[PDB]
Design a protein around this nucleic acid. Sequence first.
RNA 1: CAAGGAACUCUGCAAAUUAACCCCGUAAGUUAGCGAGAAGGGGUGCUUAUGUAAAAGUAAGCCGCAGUGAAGAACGAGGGG
RNA 2: AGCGAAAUUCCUAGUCGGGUAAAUUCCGUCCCGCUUGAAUGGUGUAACCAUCUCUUGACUGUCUCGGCUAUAGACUCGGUG
RNA 3: ACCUCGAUGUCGACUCAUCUCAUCCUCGAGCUGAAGCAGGUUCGAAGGGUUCGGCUGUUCGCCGAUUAAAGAGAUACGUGAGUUGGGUUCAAACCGUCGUGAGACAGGUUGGUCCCUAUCUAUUGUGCCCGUAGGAAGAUUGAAGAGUGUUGCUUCUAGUACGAGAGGACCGAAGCGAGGACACCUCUUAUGCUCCAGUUGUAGCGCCAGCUGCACCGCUGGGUAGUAACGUGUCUAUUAGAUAAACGCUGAAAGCAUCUAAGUGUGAAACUAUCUCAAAGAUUAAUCUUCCCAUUUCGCAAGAAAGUAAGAGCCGUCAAAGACGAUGACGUUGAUAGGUUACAGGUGUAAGCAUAGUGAUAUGUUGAGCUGAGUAAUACUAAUUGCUCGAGGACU
Lengths: 122, 229, 56, 119, 115
Amino acid sequence: MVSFMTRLNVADNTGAKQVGIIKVLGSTRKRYAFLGDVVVVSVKDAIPSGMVKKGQVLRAVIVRTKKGQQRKDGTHLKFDDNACVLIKEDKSPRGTRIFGPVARELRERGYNKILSLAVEVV
Amino acid sequence: MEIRGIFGVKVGMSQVFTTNNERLPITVIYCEPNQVAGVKTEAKDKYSATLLSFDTVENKKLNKPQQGFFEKNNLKPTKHLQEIRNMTGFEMGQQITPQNLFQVGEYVDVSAISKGRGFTGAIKRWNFKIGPLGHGAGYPHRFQGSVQAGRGGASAQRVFKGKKMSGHYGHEKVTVQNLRIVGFDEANMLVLVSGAIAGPEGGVVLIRTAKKKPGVVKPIELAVQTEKA
Amino acid sequence: AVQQRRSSKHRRDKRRSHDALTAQALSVCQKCGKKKLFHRVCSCGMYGDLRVKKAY
Amino acid sequence: SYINKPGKTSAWRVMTVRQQVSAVLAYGKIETTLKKAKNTQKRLDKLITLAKVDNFNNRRQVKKWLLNTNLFDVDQLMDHLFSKVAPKYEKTPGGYSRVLKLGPRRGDATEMAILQLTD
Amino acid sequence: KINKQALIDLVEQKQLKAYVPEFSAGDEVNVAIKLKEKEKVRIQNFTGTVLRRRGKGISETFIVRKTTDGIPIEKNFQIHNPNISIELKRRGKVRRAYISYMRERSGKAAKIKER
RNA sequence: CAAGGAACUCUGCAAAUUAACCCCGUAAGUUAGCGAGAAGGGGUGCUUAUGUAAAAGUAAGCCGCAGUGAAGAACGAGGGG
RNA sequence: AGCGAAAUUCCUAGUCGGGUAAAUUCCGUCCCGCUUGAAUGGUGUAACCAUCUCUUGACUGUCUCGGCUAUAGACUCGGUG
RNA sequence: ACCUCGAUGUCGACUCAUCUCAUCCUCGAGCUGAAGCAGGUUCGAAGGGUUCGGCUGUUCGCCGAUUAAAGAGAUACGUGAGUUGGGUUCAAACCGUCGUGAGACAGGUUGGUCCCUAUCUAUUGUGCCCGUAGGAAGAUUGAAGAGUGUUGCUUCUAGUACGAGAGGACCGAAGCGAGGACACCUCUUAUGCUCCAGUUGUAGCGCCAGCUGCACCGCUGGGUAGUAACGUGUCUAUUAGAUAAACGCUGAAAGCAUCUAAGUGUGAAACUAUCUCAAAGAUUAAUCUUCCCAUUUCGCAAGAAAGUAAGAGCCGUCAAAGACGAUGACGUUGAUAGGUUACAGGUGUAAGCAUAGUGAUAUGUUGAGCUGAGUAAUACUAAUUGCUCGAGGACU
């Protein structure tokens, strides 16, 4: 549903506007979008106050899925947009201000710090 | 060892809320309590087997030689009858109910005739790839590629038997195993089981004991609502 | 493609072996004459012992 | 091969069925194809079971499936039907018509079938 | 011999609500969710405007839209789901039982109420 | 035809969005004519009254997710040879 | 004079600075220019182009990634040859 | 310069593949100037696997971003009577050069049409005639077959052992994944043209509505069953026996030593099943269970007039099936199909009436009206008061 070269907005305060998902990590033929997907992205729209330079290949995780998914609970939550957050090889977020609504079932892949510094969890 | 199983009739599939906040697919099978029609023992028949019979109707409409055989065996006249291998723990002239052999939550295997699709394409049968249409590929666009494996009178100059090819799809007994037993209903002659069953409803569907994990069962339970105002 | 080797008369009859045509179904008519066609009306205008049709 | 006549359309089927039901209302015996015969038999039976109470709304509802003939005109045949067929067919549950299979046609070898109605 | 195939309700009887809060597909309802992440009782009242009310038996799913962080999100829920509390906030008038224009119309996202 | 939107690829070829009208607005380059319909944009329904010859026009009310509601009409910019 | 790895450089896929995450064809520049070069015109030039190429806006089943709908055939039956 | 000049299409790219091991990883083992980790070398083993982009007509080539991995070939540098022609490669022209001149350029450039209604064999299904020595109905066994065998992460084991110190084990278990494949329509999406709602103009129903026909199903939004997946659920193993390499034991020959020579072991995604599908046309024509018949008379010593009683076939109805046969089920003793009624589900306050309003409208009647595939009741209609084949056991 979301794969290589997907122009998407940013979900955390890193001074970036439009970023493209350039590769998928993990294993071969992943080619799909899911929760906690650690991928690499390149930014083309940003502001000079941003903490990352334009065109850099940096690792991020998508947090909003316009496709939506069905959970183990039996409930199908779907986003009306798509967004991602940039992180540096760990679970500590890069941006100094976190915003955007996300489900709480993301602890399976870590990211507890983002939830602790989140505006509010879904 | 021993393998236990019986036939039934798929009559529908549904869902249910279970513990740990999970919903499971629930296929429903009508399972009338059947009676063994014959036992093939190691002593005379050299192998373990047991033929059962069911879907009984009034004796008038049934076939004459087989109803005479039934009367010789002193059993009900039934439409369907078939064997199951490796079954001698149950004896001749005994009714069979799901409570006797299978509990709730263990692992079983299911067999059913696939839904008839007739002759089809290779991609719809062997999960192939569509031929491209970009920039006018032409009318010959969806096909099976080629079976060219040799040119020159000393390489193959033929087609090979067993080569992957399209053909009639479905309409065949197919099996999947490790299905979980959800529940039983003796009054309605009904069983609720997990997974999905191939083919359409109304047909005869076999369920045997899983030959992978014979004596393994995991606990699964239900829950009840409490919102009462 | 087109034919590469001609089929002989023996090959012709081997191919035409399946040219035998199956017969039809017939039914007795109690009121009219000749044997009528089964599940079909008779020439005398009558069918399920029932005449509903005008001049044949 | 490639592009040709529109041929068979759902509009064609429904207008042809309307013609056949108008014809059976006018005369009461139609020779056509057996599959078409049963297809129009279903719609005719639906109209007849809709022809029991017969208010003005039902008049228009059944008028959405009728045409005109030479013997009778649309409203005239509607009123004629309402006057005679409804008293005759009201007490029988279903089965308001019967199809009898004829033989092949010398012209076409099609399996002719005659639809008729009598209660 | 003859089977009714109506045993769908027979197996549906395992889950039956005794209060069954009923509403249309164009209203504002607050549905509470009971969650135990590791060890706690969490009651998260998920408010929002219901979108589509589908029903066929034990399987009755309905869609609800909520503006979380100013972002519209659509969630699916099941009517007889356990550990779930439902209470309507406001009941309104809607001319259709299925809405797709609310997927994009954000300006004045509220709905005209029911008299 | 969910989602992405040129990623297959010899190529944004084909295909796709506007396209009609009314009204704002319009860059660079330029032989001063153009460019240019630059682009970008806003509205077109029904009813009640007003307006002239009707109508473009206006005030209000009302509904549909959407009112040249199906119709028939240019998708572009930048740069080089 | 001019133009200079051009439609012009075999060696060579020469740089360099670029757009380009990643550019042998895209651009400006460097000048060892086999066999360029001024009426077989040359260097540019606004507009113009069913001309060629490059990047992008939107656009979508071209693709990711496959599937469905209705006619006509193809299938079966009759006449035809 | 030996076949093909009364034609063997010569680069690839796309799909479709196939095999060998001289194995890239996955497997085991050996050795090491192998403290551990990290490694490096080699052997045996082919059961499975081996990405996406950027450049270029190019394969080959390079680079990037990854994967545990991006192994090699090789089959007309596989694959056009499966696609396409970007490209050199007819006819045009250009730049540059060469040649005085027509003209030459695997130097470069723009453009330049890819012929095909399957005869046999071969192959995916599919049946029909006969057979298996009486006719059948079934159920079987299984000689020979086919499918089918993937990989990674995390946590515990344990910062344990090891190592001073960074580092950090082996084995096992548990959960999480990816891909591969099976089926499914509970949920989620696409479709769902005799379905619904709204909508738009034209022509008429003598008029207003209310309509049909047409305008891509007129347009838009949905949606029943079914049909599919992006959605679900599953499988990703375990074991036994014989083995490669490797490691053995005893042990002499060759009084010691030695895995070997007798004997005596383990042993790998390798090998046989193990799991799945069908399978007696499995002609070596196998097996069992049940029913039927064994009825005037000479023959070519066979049973000929009486032609099953076991049934089969024609026809109808349909589909669970199904291109069409064939198959499954039912034929007045029938719910087999259609009909009608109720119901499910879909759509969403039918139309009319009345109220207030100059009017779009709002309200009660009204969750009503209607609704293709869905459920059961229901013999109301059709499966005929029908026809053809179909009985006596040869020989060793």
